[model samples]
Target chain A: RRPVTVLGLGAMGRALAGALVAAGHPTTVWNRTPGRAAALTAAGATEAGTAAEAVAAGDLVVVCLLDDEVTRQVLALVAPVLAGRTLVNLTNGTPEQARRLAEWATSHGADHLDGGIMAVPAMIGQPGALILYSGPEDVFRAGRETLAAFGAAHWLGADPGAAALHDLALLAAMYGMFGGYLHAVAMIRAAGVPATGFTPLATDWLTAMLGALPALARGVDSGDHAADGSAVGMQAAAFGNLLAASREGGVSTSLLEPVRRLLDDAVRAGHGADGLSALVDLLRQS
Target chain B: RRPVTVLGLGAMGRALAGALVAAGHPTTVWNRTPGRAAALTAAGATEAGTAAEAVAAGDLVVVCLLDDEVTRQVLALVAPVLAGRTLVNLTNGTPEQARRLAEWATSHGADHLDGGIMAVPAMIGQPGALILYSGPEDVFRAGRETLAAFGAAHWLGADPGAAALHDLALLAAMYGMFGGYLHAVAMIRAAGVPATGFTPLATDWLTAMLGALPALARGVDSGDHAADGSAVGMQAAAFGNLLAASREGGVSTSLLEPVRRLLDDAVRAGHGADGLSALVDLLRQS
Candidate 1:
């Protein structure tokens, strides 16, 4: 197998390096901080001491730094050596930052693939771990075989910014689930519920809720926001009860109040009987 | 083999009656509008003329009116007919309302079982149609076989308020997911993507996030809001992108801003290294 070079031995970086080396791809590792590549090197990866050496070591260079700014700062150290190579930057960044990095990489004679790892460090090589990427199709296709060592690799498009955009959008949706869980769990936990007991319900309920996304998306697409009973007023009434109960239970109502307000606004605008998706229109133009 | 009465012949009530009739139970159904029970009656159910006749025709009375107030209004007309029978109110309500209805039923010499049907009208008698109940254990057990015809009967506890509480909790969590979808769809749809193009990602991505929940709940349980990478500062920075992207896309940030505010507050308070679950604490006081 052709060797790959991994820069930035942060936890995610190390995991990527470890997966590569374990998969029998002679891996080369580098880090700004020393002593970070010992395990990878022990697994038959060569430790590159300098950024230039790291970039010159392999046809594919993977970087996972603290952020896009730090990634560019380090990648700049090797820009002169990056010609004919692919810089697969799997760093945390916004789409604008990604586009900028993509442009910089291309300007220096390297093909670029902006990557977003939608998994934790431990989930890097496991099922359900998806890493989204965006760049030139042939650039991605040329590197697809090597990238499969990471996880499920999804090529979103050639926009260069698509990975970061989807990454943020996906993470925001996830964080919404977590935030809502914490809020509602606090409602249950304050009343002395155990985390384990409540955990299963969270998973099951979210799965059931996941079943609603398509219909919700369809409803949003058609601009028809009515369910049999999810009228804005009814949902607002339910939100009032949720707020009151959370109040009585000494739980915070901060996160949930926004939805309540949206419901109220929709009801006030004569959409009281519309499905809760009516709030989506209210959410547009904000 | 047992007799069951269904009141308020709306979509859910009709489904309940239809399910009972399909399952070979002796079912009687009544509606205020008089013609709503025709389908159920044709499905081997007996349609009664009034609420009193409905209540008198069976050993178990099930009412799913527009609201608890209306449930009470119609149940009052059958107060003289409910002695020694069981009343299962599968209505939408708060815990307090459920408790009040349970009390009202018991005061009328009926064994009361408060139910929260966690399914749409069409899901009655289906595998995942969870019907949650909370009341006297003996009464539920006695009617458990009969109630199983409606859906999966889960006895929450004896509080008479537990079913409604869990129902609301489950709903808020589900609504959070739907609200998150609308917020995110607006972001993607703004980029000229159709819902059909996006729905697959929603399904696959949500299943992935749903997989994170048990671990998320575990971390919250341990009070150690620390992950290898989910620090508050990082999440807050990412939230900035999500919010900015929303702004750039003409999508309203109303539904998602609360979590961003919480993250910002957590980062400002020097808990930036803590797990995002740390926001659960901030949510309680706010």
Candidate 2:
């Protein structure tokens, strides 16, 4: 197994380091704090006293710092030791930040790959955990097997910003779903119903609704935006009823109001006969 | 098989009548306008010239009109025929409207059951089609066999409005998921990526994220929304980054700004250490 070094022993860092150690890789870990590496140390993983020492110990240096700022700050301290090494940054960051960091790492004689961990701390090492990476194709190919120890690894070409963009995009979508779900649960609960009772139906309904994503994608990509079923105007008329019902149920309409606005805007923009996919054009406008 | 009458031959009504006819239930159908029932007529359904005649021909009178107002208007004209029959109103409506209509129908010597169809017109007879009903338990029991021909049948007790509440709740949740998905696709597309390329990842990411719903439900229902992982305060701090990223990508933050507001509200309410489910309480407040 290739030696691996993990910097940042927070929840996610520990999960990544532990998975590498369990995969029989000689793993070294370092945290900003003194005693956060207790579990890794007990799991037959070596704990380094300094970030530089950890960087020197392994060919693959995995960084899962708190944010982009911390990631850059820590990596700057170990630049001299980074030559001929692979810096795998799994930090949550913007696309521009990833590109800047990628260029900086390459200048210091390191192959850089920016990654977005699609799973939480607990999901790491699980079959469903997905890690999206973007950087040099050869570097990803060489490290693919070792990376697979953490979870499924998807390479998004050589553009280092692609992974970060996809990551943020996915996250924005997640929050949208969550906002709607919390509102749904709250509305049902206000009617003296338990969320558990409503959840099965919600999951089933959402799952079935997801089947439309592919068709939605086609409409947006082709820019056809024709109504396959309900038109934007018909939907706009009915959309307000949800907001009204939510208010009557004593649930806040904050989350749903914006959608109604989008529908109304679509109708006003003369896309009334078009499908919901036409809303994409409004968002794409500067 | 029991005789069934489907009022209103719009897309949904035709699908219902067609399914009933296919199941050999001696189906009768009628619409406000002529020529809409041609397909159902070809499918062995008897097309009634008048709704009163249609309602009088069957023991199960299913109403699938455009909305609550139309349903009420149409049903009032055939009130006398409703006697000794079961009135199943599957119109999309508010819970209060459902309850009022249920009481009004019961006064006319008919057993009333309000239903909310969880599928679109095309999915009416498909495997995933789900129909939620609420009224008398015995009414649902006696008609369960016939209703199963349309799709899955779920009875939500005798509140009469329970089905509509559940239906709207599900719709609200669906819109939330859709809004997020569009934003995600748009963001990725702005970065020179096709939505078709990103949809597989989005669906998988969303499906996995949905696994967290039950836990979120548990937190909301039990009112014990203590953080099991990331706290509300930390999430609030990091949530703005998504908005900023969306702006940079030239995607409107309209859909996402509401969720950021929610997280900020949860933190301000001094639930900083609580989970995302704590946002439910904020919505529940008037």
Candidate 3:
């Protein structure tokens, strides 16, 4: 079996190292802070004293660090040992940063697989947890089995930034959910209801309602006003009531204001009969 | 059992009439266009010829017209017959209009229940379906048994506009959910994934994440950063990646833009360690 080196010892980093050890890999781990790696070291893994030594212990180096800058600082210390290795960066960063890091890895004689982990630390080894990677198909194929020790792995084609791109999209979706959930809870609380009692209904109803996504996507893609979908005008009318409700319920409408304005513009532009996706036209205009 | 009259033939109106019939009430049905009452007539309901006759047929007159204007027209025709009866207006309208109608009913020696239905027609009798009403407690209690035919009726205190206010709040929540779902579907489509395949996961994951609501609500209410439940800074960092992903995946980011901007501003204000509810501060600022 191939050996793997895990860098960083944050919550996510520690989870990744633990999963590798559990999968029976010959794992070597290192962290900037000396005492942080104590738990992983006791779990049948080698603890390296220096970054270069950690890199030299394995063919695959998985780096899950605090940020792009910290990852770069650590990589600089281990650059000499990167020769003939595959560097998979699961650090959170922008696409441009991911692409730039890919170039830096290649300069050090290391094949790069820009990766994005799409699960929380607790879900590191679960079936639904996914790590998206982009860049050299051959490199990914060679290390695929070993990477599976962490989670289900997805290859997002050859663009070095593809994995980060998809990772960000999923994150965006998650936050959108967060914002809406926050607003709904606030509104219900304004009504003097305990959120715990109202949550089950909110979840079940909202999830069922989310099924309208495909139809909405088609509207955005086609930009066809005659699409068989709910009209923007109807949505705007409904939105008027939404704003009023917030005022009446003593909840803030700040979060929903932008959306309301977009709908208003879409309707004012004579796209009332068009699908809600018609807001894209207004967005593109500005 | 008291006789109940349902006026109007819209989807919601029909649903109300059907529920009344199902509950074994003596129902009188009327619609301006005539044939709209065929189903009710066949179900042993009395089909009244005019609005006045409909109002006179029952001790409780339920109206679910299109808007306040149409409601005014219908009520004018039934004004004389409305004396000493109870009027429950379920039509979509503003709080001002609801209060105005309440005043009008009182002048004519009629009690009024300004009510709002929080369910679609199909969900009329479901356990979670709720009917919110605001009016005299005695009037509400008098009609409680008859109202149960519609759904799980909720008495929202005695303000005539309270039910409409709550109604709007619920609608706001529904629209927020719709917007988030649309954005998610668009992102997945950009990935060349069939939306149907992603729907189950998307819905299930979001449903589980709904547990974050109460923490967020407490954050919003107390205006205290103690919850720090999910830091604004962390969310802002993740949002940067989300925007990049949307650009790469061919998804339209218009719907996601307002949220991203809000998160960015919150981070810039140095409230990154604060709860996401700190967004309410930014929203109320301008």
Candidate 4:
């Protein structure tokens, strides 16, 4: 198997190293503070004293760090040895950060791939874990086999920031659902319904709701915001009842306020007859 | 089979009536403006000229109306013949409205079962359609066979408003997801990625995020807001980057503003180490 080095010993970093070792790759692990790679080392992985040392030991260097700042600092420390090696960064960062890092890695004469890890630490190396990457088609192709140790690998595009852009977008969507779910639980909890008891209904309803996403996506892509049946105006008029019900149930309506305003704006702008996808144009304007 | 009366011929009302007719029930449908039930009538449903006539024709009268006022007006029109029959109000309304209507029906010597239809018009009579009912357990039991014509039936409790409360909660959750989804698509669209291309990743990620819902429910139920791994403070620190990315992408941050503020509040109130479910308490306070 090919050699791979993992930088940063956070939960996610360790998981990556553990996966590499389990895949029979010659794995080298490093952290800012030493002794964090005991489990990996015990599992036939090598421990390096410094980031630069780890970078020099492997053909592929995977870095998962605290933030963009820490990632940059570590990259600078290893710059001298980075030449001719591939740098795979799985840090959670903005697209802007990813682009700059990609440029910096290129400047250091290293192949760079910016990635977003979509799975939690425990899910690493598991069947469902997914890792999204972007940066140079040839670089992705060259590293495909080695990257498979992490789980599913998706190469978005060559923009370097594409992975981060989509990653953040997906995270944004995830948080929105979480916020709404918390609100829903709060609303029903006020009415004395146990959160556990109500979960099945919420999950089932959300699952059913997901089936409409393809249609919504089609509407967005076509820019054909016309309503098939449910118009923005009618929806806006009926939305206030949800707010009132939230208030009556003693649950905060903060999570729902923006959505109502958007629907109302769609109506006010004479897009009342349009579908819910009409909000996309308004969001763009904002 | 027992005869069933369906009042209102709007899309959902028609679906309900159509389902009953298809289920081989002796169905009677009525509408304020005549001629809306032509399809239902063609499908072996009898259209009554007046609301009272429809109500008198069947032991089970299903009411699906526009708003609370229209529902009340129709109820009053049929009040004289409402005695000794079961009135199933499936209109979308507040829990308060459901409770009041239930009281009004009981005073007229009618069994009341307030319901919240959880499916779209097209989903009625389909496998996944779910109808929630609350008011009287005995009433629900008696109508189970006929109600099965519409879809799945869930009897919440005898509070009358329980169905509406849960229904609205689920809708609120649905809107939250839709808002987030729109925002996510908008963000990626700014980067020139079509909504169709980004949808698979978003859906998959959202599906994975759902795996945590059970644990979150446990947190809320046990009142154990302690962090399992991801703490609110660390998440708060990382949360701003999403807003920054959204702004950079020219997507409206409105959908995300409340969530950011909620996280900020969670951190400020010293629930920093608590899990995301801690936000539920903060939402209740607001």
lDDT values, one for every candidate: 0.80, 0.88, 0.76, 0.88
What is the DockQ score, from 0 to 1, of model 3? 0.27
Q: Can you tell me which runs of candidate 1 are displaced by over 4 Å?
A: A1-9, A17-58, A71-82, A125-128, A218-238, A263-282, B1-58, B69-83, B103-108, B125-128, B218-234, B264-282
In the order shown, the candidates' DockQ scores are 0.42, 0.63, 0.27, 0.61
Q: For model 2 chain A, where is the 10-residue window of minimal lDDT?
A: A235-244
Residue-level lDDT of model 3, residues A135-183, one tens digit each, is 8999899989988988988897887877776666556556667666666
Better of 3 and 4 by lDDT: 4
lDDT, residue A12, model 1: 87
The window of 10 residues in a row where model 1 chain B has the poorest summed lDDT is B277-286
| Tens-digit lDDT track of model 1 for B47-91 | 888889989998988888888779879988889989999999887
Fnat for candidate 1 (0 to 1): 0.48
For candidate 3, give the docking quality class from DockQ.
acceptable
- The sequence of per-residue lDDT tens digits that candidate 2 reaches over residues B1-286 is 9999999888788889888998889999998899988877787889888899999999999998988999989999999888999999898888889999988998999999989887767778778788999999999999999998899999988999999888889878988998999899889888889998889989988998888888888998898997866678877876766777787888889898889888888877899989988988798756
Task: Specify the poorest-scoring 10-residue window by lDDT in model 4 chain B.
Answer: B226-235
| Residue B78 error, candidate 1, Å | 6.4
How many residue pairs in model 4 have overlapping backbones? 0
Give the CAPRI class of candidate 1: acceptable
Score candidate 3 by TM-score against the native: 0.75
Worst 10 residues of 1 chain A by lDDT: A226-235
Relative to the real complex, the DockQ score for model 4 comes to 0.61
